[PDB]
Design a protein around this nucleic acid. Structure first.
Lengths: 106, 106
DNA sequence: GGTTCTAGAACC
DNA sequence: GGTTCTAGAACC
């Protein structure tokens, strides 16, 4: 049976009504958390038994997800935090059959 | 010369105008972050070159601070996150002479 | 030294 | 398995 974390993550990303906060990236190769602070306080506790981004991120890394790092190539944008993007080779828009390949690290 | 992190942490805690966000606990044995989300976005970047609670906490642990853990002894308070308290034996209200005993772990 | 990303371990 | 707290390592 699919781990709850992955089922819930898929649901979160795929669901349109959460797309202000968490959504597929534009080519469906990763997912975005667009408003980390409101995602954590308003969305996480509806799905998990916490409201901590750090605990969500710990689960992402536990299941092999990696952060897509965004650098400041140019002007420093202090006004805007760089959304927050995570990727797994087997977490892909339109490819729910691949989810079974994702494994918890221990 | 005192590490910038410790100088800035002392300043943050001691300064009255930041006390909505970060302040001594009531017996001066620890410090409190009362509004983690606004502390991180409004206060951290005035002092450090980031606005991430996780990066602040990493520095706390790097210098030997530990979280004072708060358990739900009774009713679950989902509406209210449990402020956030950190302690170091040598970080103490009215005892700035002790700060020199705090050491970075590597 | 400071910041970021990820993971080990304890606790649940 | 999930959540929390802390630390190793890479990058700056």
């Amino acid at each position: 049976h699919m781990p709850a974390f992955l089922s819930k993550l898929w649901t979160l990303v795929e669901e349109t009504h959460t797309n202000e906060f968490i959504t597929w990236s534009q080519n469906g190769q990763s997912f975005l958390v667009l408003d980390e602070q409101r995602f954590a306080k308003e969305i996480l506790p509806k799905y998990f038994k916490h409201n901590n981004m750090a605990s969500f991120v710990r689960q992402l890394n536990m299941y092999g997800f990696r952060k897509v790092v965004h650098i400041d190539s140019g002007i420093v944008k202090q006004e805007r935090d760089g959304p927050v993007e995570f990727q797994h080779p087997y977490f892909k828009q339109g490819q729910d059959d691949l989810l079974e390949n994702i494994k918890r690290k221990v």
